[PDB]
Scaffold this active site. Structure first.
Site, PDB file in Angstrom:
ATOM      1  N   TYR A  80       6.332  12.447   2.438  1.00 12.52           N
ATOM      2  CA  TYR A  80       5.261  12.862   3.332  1.00 12.52           C
ATOM      3  C   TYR A  80       5.815  13.224   4.703  1.00 12.52           C
ATOM      4  O   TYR A  80       6.856  12.699   5.119  1.00 12.52           O
ATOM      5  CB  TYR A  80       4.204  11.754   3.474  1.00 12.52           C
ATOM      6  CG  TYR A  80       3.432  11.511   2.203  1.00 12.52           C
ATOM      7  CD1 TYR A  80       2.695  12.529   1.625  1.00 12.52           C
ATOM      8  CD2 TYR A  80       3.443  10.271   1.577  1.00 12.52           C
ATOM      9  CE1 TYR A  80       1.991  12.330   0.459  1.00 12.52           C
ATOM     10  CE2 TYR A  80       2.734  10.058   0.401  1.00 12.52           C
ATOM     11  CZ  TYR A  80       2.008  11.099  -0.150  1.00 12.52           C
ATOM     12  OH  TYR A  80       1.291  10.928  -1.310  1.00 12.52           O
TER      13      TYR A  80
HETATM   14  C1  4IL Z   1       0.440   6.512   5.027  1.00 10.74           C
HETATM   15  O1  4IL Z   1      -0.298   6.327   3.831  1.00 10.74           O
HETATM   16  C2  4IL Z   1      -0.627   7.431   3.097  1.00 10.74           C
HETATM   17  C3  4IL Z   1      -0.282   8.722   3.518  1.00 10.74           C
HETATM   18  C4  4IL Z   1      -0.614   9.820   2.776  1.00 10.74           C
HETATM   19  C5  4IL Z   1      -1.317   9.642   1.583  1.00 10.74           C
HETATM   20  C6  4IL Z   1      -1.834  10.523   0.569  1.00 10.74           C
HETATM   21  C7  4IL Z   1      -2.455   9.723  -0.377  1.00 10.74           C
HETATM   22  N1  4IL Z   1      -2.326   8.412  -0.025  1.00 10.74           N
HETATM   23  C8  4IL Z   1      -2.866   7.282  -0.765  1.00 10.74           C
HETATM   24  C9  4IL Z   1      -1.920   6.167  -0.975  1.00 10.74           C
HETATM   25  C10 4IL Z   1      -2.131   5.127  -1.764  1.00 10.74           C
HETATM   26  C11 4IL Z   1      -1.067   4.187  -2.230  1.00 10.74           C
HETATM   27  C12 4IL Z   1      -3.484   4.814  -2.299  1.00 10.74           C
HETATM   28  C13 4IL Z   1      -1.649   8.343   1.174  1.00 10.74           C
HETATM   29  C14 4IL Z   1      -1.308   7.229   1.924  1.00 10.74           C
HETATM   30  C15 4IL Z   1      -3.068  10.207  -1.645  1.00 10.74           C
HETATM   31  C16 4IL Z   1      -2.230   9.588  -2.738  1.00 10.74           C
HETATM   32  C17 4IL Z   1      -2.425   8.544  -3.528  1.00 10.74           C
HETATM   33  C18 4IL Z   1      -1.400   8.119  -4.530  1.00 10.74           C
HETATM   34  C19 4IL Z   1      -3.646   7.682  -3.482  1.00 10.74           C
HETATM   35  N2  4IL Z   1      -2.807  11.636  -1.837  1.00 10.74           N
HETATM   36  C20 4IL Z   1      -3.372  12.186  -2.908  1.00 10.74           C
HETATM   37  O2  4IL Z   1      -4.214  11.600  -3.570  1.00 10.74           O
HETATM   38  C21 4IL Z   1      -2.916  13.570  -3.274  1.00 10.74           C
HETATM   39  C22 4IL Z   1      -2.736  13.839  -4.753  1.00 10.74           C
HETATM   40  C23 4IL Z   1      -1.745  14.955  -4.741  1.00 10.74           C
HETATM   41  C24 4IL Z   1      -0.728  14.512  -3.718  1.00 10.74           C
HETATM   42  N3  4IL Z   1      -1.567  13.804  -2.749  1.00 10.74           N
HETATM   43  C25 4IL Z   1      -1.173  13.384  -1.554  1.00 10.74           C
HETATM   44  O3  4IL Z   1      -0.086  13.633  -1.082  1.00 10.74           O
HETATM   45  C26 4IL Z   1      -2.211  12.553  -0.868  1.00 10.74           C
HETATM   46  O4  4IL Z   1      -3.159  13.545  -0.499  1.00 10.74           O
HETATM   47  C27 4IL Z   1      -1.805  11.957   0.441  1.00 10.74           C
HETATM   48  O5  4IL Z   1      -1.492  12.689   1.358  1.00 10.74           O
END
Ligand code: 4IL
Ligand code: 4IL
Ligand code: AKG
Ligand code: AKG
Ligand code: CO
Ligand code: CO
EC number: 1.14.11.38
Lengths: 285, 287
Positions: free
Chosen positions: A63
């Site tokens: 990220y």
């Molecule tokens: C600093 O803490 C963060 C930063 C950025 C993101 C961030 C997302 N979480 C959730 C994290 C969890 C462990 C629940 C983030 C947490 C979320 C990803 C997941 C795994 C829930 N996520 C997406 O669902 C989509 C799907 C395609 C790729 N994606 C992304 O990169 C992102 O949009 C995204 O930026």
């Protein structure tokens, strides 16, 4: 325009779950006393002052530098481990929310800090940790719940969490516009609770000069789903200083999904994990 | 044109043909996957566990069921043949990588033994999905998250209660109360293996032989790494874990795993680092 509902901390729990199904999210006002928020913050002040490690960082490497990150706060912040994680109101909501799926536990709990000048977070669902959730029909027993703690104030200026009400009834996430969402402006001690499949995003700090926006995300899953963070390397003395509820949340005890699973899960030698380990607990002398 | 039966294939058959069979029939049999001495070695490590006096205390699974079977849980922690040879069989993992390609990584959720002695009644018809009830609501077209691999350690015959599989029952919405006649028998020799798809209804047959050696079967149950393993192998000694291969360690939950996208980070991690690096884990094939 319809906004997120604000409820008193002693509000009815069945009423809250009804809000999760209708709107998808709501806010609890004044759940955490000032001293609890204050000691949690100083424990995160310690972790934030540590330089990030030299090697591989599995999440931060994927990220942009739009945020600072402290993983698994339960292993470094006793106030979360021994107080916030076992909050009686939070667990009254989980028990009613997860009643159809069975036992739940903590899949992840981390801190993110958004300093001045950082862009918004993309609209997302927290289901992406376990991609099978995408195929769960809306009427199936819920398996995921997101509990968002503001540790600083949440304002329109500093990028309060943005929630799209009713978005859990969309099939896909798509590319929504920011003005479709509603701000979760809160004071420290409040809680934002977000149902499975609800589309949301962090706001992005527009303040010219000030303390960063600080938010702790606690992610509760059904015990049928593998925890994102494993708390298995925690020192035994730390684990044994927790309550039974706390140990269960961090995957140290055998858990029970609902029927048709009539045996349990996370067991060994046909015994409960905690008996095999001979695990002491602080409220189980 | 008689009653449809379970297809039998050679171990060296193509894996994409095997996957087509899992989707059409729901199950198939591989012939001569394991050499007889591997099965015999497995049978004698389990003979030892059977000779240990039963532990006086709570038994989570056995206490829920009548005495219609003898049970040895998590054979991977007490049977080196399973831990070092069966569990990492290359054909088994060729099937798993093809079957689980759309879900991402997979690991071992459970592996236990059932001994059914002469005179024990049948096992009720069931789906192994019931360990994770959320599977019931998965659309049939969603990426599979579960697979059952059934090893016969003795001969499977009609009289001793060979595993009964209901072909095509994964296209049923629910299990219901099927008749035994709806199933086909998985009669096999030791060394064979029966592969059963998620949602396929099946059951053990119950030993009708008046006199003879009990039927032995080992179920190896593989889940997507998104699903919590039924048995946890975290109490294994470090010396035993480090004697395994990397693949072996991955199957028993000792390494960070990767579900498919949209999960781009991974799962089963700690301190934002891989578990095997936090633990400084050695392996037999990773110097
Ligand atoms: C600093 O803490 C963060 C930063 C950025 C993101 C961030 C997302 N979480 C959730 C994290 C969890 C462990 C629940 C983030 C947490 C979320 C990803 C997941 C795994 C829930 N996520 C997406 O669902 C989509 C799907 C395609 C790729 N994606 C992304 O990169 C992102 O949009 C995204 O930026
Ligand atoms: C000795 O090893 C055994 C004996 C007996 C059963 C047995 C079932 N397994 C599967 C166990 C695994 C860990 C794969 C058994 C295993 C199966 C239970 C589950 C958890 C998949 N099961 C059911 O799905 C239904 C749903 C309603 C209650 N059920 C039952 O009681 C039973 O039918 C049932 O008898
Ligand atoms: O930073 C926020 O307020 C939201 C963060 C969030 O939803 C997430 O990282 O999953
Ligand atoms: O005994 C058998 O062959 C059936 C095994 C089985 O279906 C189970 O116990 O999950
Ligand atoms: Co989120
Ligand atoms: Co079965």
């Amino acid at each position: 325009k319809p906004q997120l509902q604000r409820l008193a901390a002693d509000a009815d729990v069945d009423r809250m779950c009804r809000l999760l199904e209708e709107d998808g999210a709501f806010i609890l006002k004044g759940l955490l006393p000032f001293d609890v928020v204050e000691s949690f913050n100083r424990e995160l002040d310690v972790q934030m002052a540590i330089p990030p490690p030299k090697g591989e960082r599995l999440l931060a490497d994927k990220y942009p530098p739009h945020f600072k990150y402290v993983p698994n706060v339960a292993t470094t912040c006793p106030t979360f481990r021994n107080t916030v994680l076992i909050n009686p109101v939070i667990h009254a909501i989980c028990e009613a929310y997860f009643q159809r799926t069975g036992d739940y536990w903590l899949s992840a709990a981390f801190l993110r800090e958004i300093e001045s000048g950082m862009p918004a977070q993309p609209f997302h669902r927290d289901d992406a940790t376990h991609p099978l959730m995408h195929y769960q029909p809306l009427e199936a027993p819920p398996v995921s719940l997101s509990v968002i703690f503001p540790l600083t104030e949440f304002t329109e200026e500093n990028g309060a969490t943005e929630v799209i009400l009713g978005s859990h009834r969309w099939t896909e996430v798509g590319t929504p516009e920011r003005d479709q969402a509603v701000l979760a402006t809160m004071d420290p001690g409040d809680v934002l609770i977000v149902r499975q499949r609800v589309v949301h995003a962090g706001g992005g700090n527009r303040t010219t000069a000030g303390k960063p926006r600080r938010v702790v995300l606690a992610y509760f899953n059904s015990v049928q789903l593998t925890p994102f963070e494993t708390y298995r390397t925690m020192p035994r003395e730390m684990v044994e200083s927790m309550t039974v509820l706390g140990q269960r949340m961090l995957g140290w005890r055998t858990m029970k999904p609902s029927d048709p699973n009539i045996v349990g899960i996370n067991l060994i030698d046909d015994k409960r994990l905690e008996n095999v380990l001979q695990l002491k607990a602080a409220d189980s002398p």
